[PDB]
């Protein structure tokens, strides 16, 4: 059981060592499409690339590339698209991906500005009456409503395909209080946020996969998917303590490199799953 494993690694301060074993054990697959010179300006970070085997393809004949990975967790019956925070030139591609994958929710775990730099383009409208048009992908986006709380904001958005005049409602879940450095002290507001995404229906098999991002789509985004998948597997298995976080993380790393960036994010993931297990047992 992980509670005991937590105390061990914590009391022995072995987090950096566990983290290094995960780094060593992690899969490495080709990412040839990401490294094509024509895709250089579609990537926020040159060292963060989707693997070719799990990458999301855009349905445009010209250039199908977006920095986005499908993470398929077979036993948990959960899928997630993990992506980078859009660039000024990829906002249209981002919403094209949301449209084409039939996603119901977008989960954002960063602020647009952190540490005095832009971590993400402003890719949604700030006011009801000022809609955004993406001329390159023929999509219109309208803010319908915005519910601002202490730790997170939920926004209802209408996405309209200008080519076919279909419209869908998208929910934008924006966790606004992840600190500039380190991890939250307590996982309580993160768990509350995760239960709110679940309650929306956004993670349900009726819909396309949820889109999850931070700046690179590997660190905070990683913590989100890992916590969700681990808690769901604890519901599903005869023996909930058979759930090994490290194994789940390694299975997720077959689909996108670098998920969980620091030993602190790993410790936080254990804490989130341990605490979430109380609200689930
Ligand atoms: C790194 C690759 S592209 C890029 C960019 N595009 C627009 C703003 N920053 C930064």
From Swiss-Prot:
There is a cross-link at residues 214-215 (N,N-(cysteine-1,S-diyl)serine (Cys-Ser)). The modification Cysteine sulfenic acid (-SOH) is found at residue 214. Expressed in keratinocytes (at protein level). The modification Cysteine persulfide is found at residue 214. Disulfide bonds: none annotated. Its main location: endoplasmic reticulum. GO terms for cellular component: cytoplasm; cytoplasmic side of endoplasmic reticulum membrane; cytosol; early endosome; endoplasmic reticulum; endosome lumen; glutamatergic synapse; mitochondrial crista. The modification S-nitrosocysteine is found at residue 214. One of its GO terms (molecular function) is non-membrane spanning protein tyrosine phosphatase activity. This is Tyrosine-protein phosphatase non-receptor type 1. It comes from Homo sapiens. The chain holds residues 2 to 282 of 435 of the full protein.
């Amino acid at each position: 059981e992980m509670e005991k494993e937590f105390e061990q690694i914590d009391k022995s301060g072995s987090w950096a060592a566990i983290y290094q074993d995960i780094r060593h054990e992690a899969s490495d697959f080709p990412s040839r499409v990401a490294k094509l010179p024509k895709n250089k300006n579609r990537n926020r970070y040159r060292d963060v690339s989707p693997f070719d085997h799990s990458r999301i393809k855009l349905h445009q004949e010209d250039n199908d590339y977006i920095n986005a990975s499908l993470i398929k967790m077979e036993e948990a019956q959960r899928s997630y698209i993990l992506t980078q925070g859009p660039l000024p030139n990829t906002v249209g591609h981002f919403w094209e991906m949301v449209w084409e994958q039939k996603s119901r929710g977008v989960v954002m775990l960063n602020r647009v500005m952190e540490k005095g730099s832009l971590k993400c383009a402003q890719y949604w409208p700030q006011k009801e009456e000022k809609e955004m048009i993406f001329e390159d992908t023929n999509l219109k986006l309208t803010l319908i409503s915005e519910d601002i709380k202490s730790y997170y904001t939920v926004r209802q958005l209408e996405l309209e395909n200008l080519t076919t005049q279909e419209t869908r409602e998208i929910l934008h879940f924006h966790y606004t209080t992840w600190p500039d450095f380190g991890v939250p002290e307590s996982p309580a507001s993160f768990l509350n946020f995760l239960f709110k995404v679940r309650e929306s229906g956004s993670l349900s098999p009726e819909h396309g996969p949820v889109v999850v991002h931070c700046s690179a789509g590997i660190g905070r985004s990683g913590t989100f998917c890992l916590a969700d998948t681990c808690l769901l597997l604890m519901d599903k298995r005869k023996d909930p303590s058979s759930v090994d976080i490290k194994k789940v993380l390694l299975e997720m790393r077959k689909f996108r490199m670098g998920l969980i960036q620091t030993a602190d994010q790993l410790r936080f993931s254990y804490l989130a799953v341990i605490e979430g297990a109380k609200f689930i047992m």
